């Protein structure tokens, strides 16, 4: 055991709102559309250093299409965190953020660290969700909401480590 921690993070949310772009920029510091839509569940790793501890990570990515709902449930089990990502430019993806939270209750552990994220903020011209509108539902439930972007790398490192610490609290 060369690592001090083993955490498993799951990324759920509407399909098309950058759950992969946020998983690649955080694991590989890159961004491109040369990749095809994720089919099922993807698995990446990125070890960090916080509080002088080897925090090895095991991020699990999942599709968004309603059909992949039944198949994704078999992953909410040993989840130490759940980053319900939503597109801040697509109103639809903002409403469903509530539904993805429900799925979490039915399947993920009662004490799962819920971390909200509004990705794709660079395109402010075509944005629809005010930092206040979202933060409202977020702070209403104790969800550390942060606006990020996998393109500008805004809060990509920040909004991600937030879970790495929020989890170290229960341990």
């Amino acid at each position: 055991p060369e690592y001090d921690y083993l955490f498993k993070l799951l990324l759920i949310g509407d399909s098309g709102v950058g759950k992969s772009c946020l998983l690649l920029r955080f694991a590989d510091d890159t961004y491109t559309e040369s990749y095809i839509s994720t089919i099922g569940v993807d698995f990446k790793i990125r070890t960090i250093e916080l509080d002088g501890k080897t925090i090895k990570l095991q991020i699990w990515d999942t599709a968004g299409q309603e059909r992949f709902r039944t198949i994704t449930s078999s992953y909410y089990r040993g989840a130490h965190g759940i980053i319900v990502v939503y597109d801040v430019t697509d109103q639809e993806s903002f409403n469903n953020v509530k539904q993805w939270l429900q799925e979490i209750d039915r399947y993920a552990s009662e004490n799962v660290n819920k971390l909200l994220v509004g990705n794709k903020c660079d395109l402010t011209t075509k944005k629809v969700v005010d930092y206040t509108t979202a933060k409202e539902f977020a702070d209403s439930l104790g969800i550390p909401f942060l606006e990020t972007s996998a393109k500008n790398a805004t809060n990509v490192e920040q909004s991600f480590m937030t879970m790495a610490a929020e989890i170290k609290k229960r341990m």
């Binding site: 559309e33 698995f43 198949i71």
Partner: protein, 351 residues
Amino acid sequence: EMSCAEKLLKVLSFGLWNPTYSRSERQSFQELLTVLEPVYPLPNELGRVSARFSDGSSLRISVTNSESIEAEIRTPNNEKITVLLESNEQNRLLQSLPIDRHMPYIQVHRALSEMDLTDTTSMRNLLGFTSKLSTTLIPHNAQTDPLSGPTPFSSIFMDTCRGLGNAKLSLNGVDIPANAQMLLRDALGLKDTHSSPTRNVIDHGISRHDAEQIARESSGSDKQKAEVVEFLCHPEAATAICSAFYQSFNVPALTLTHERISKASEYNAERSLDTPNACINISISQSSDGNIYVTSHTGVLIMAPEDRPNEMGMLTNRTSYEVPQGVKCTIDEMVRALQPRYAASETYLQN
């Protein structure tokens, strides 16, 4: 002077998997098998395959439900040659053919001589092959049907943006390179992952302008190119291309081996095997009759069963269907009209 088509048919008849091949020859075969494109099968058929080689020859293999394999060829001097074939446990013929069959279990295939799994390129090179092999028709219930539920064919458009230019496309044997796809992605009015095809592109298909271009930037004889143009001009064609990229077509098969699929993801995340999530290999052909057949099989690395440890392979979830003459590229019609057949197959490296 054995015609190109005659070669392939001869090989497949003796056994594409025959270990006696000096490997040097395996290369000689891969180049032909990848030219086989599944097309609209006749009523009493279980699968039809066509291929237009460079020597002007052509091959047409049919497979009745009685698993009867009839084949027809046409040498450069148009010499219609019909040859009845037979498949035995020796040549595994009925295996080296892109045809979904009724099997009690997911079909298992073995790659060829060198095919190895390492980088993005090594993945596509494999899928190019497996997609030309048989599969196992997987049933689907209303709960796992890619066309049921609340939002059917919802991401069909966005699934194409991040799809085109990164997939192995084929329109009547005419390979559609990267730049080619990116050109189509434009004519389809699919800019951002939130836009939808222009109202005009739906009623009239791809403008004769963009369409004609895509052809020029595609591998194929001048004669062939022209065809791709007449195809990319009908409103139906749009519905056929945007649908083939659907992401949920994998649900039917995934819900069968999604467990072993993740085990493969783990063995890679740790091994730092630089390999993308999945790969798409599409094959769209329009018979002279007018029918439009779309075959889109997706590739995904999967871990072999329990008995065979530490042996990785690739699952090929195939999805074939027809495009009714009239179905326009709209999230709605696509769901009411189309009836896709889902079938996958596991392929493991030769190690």
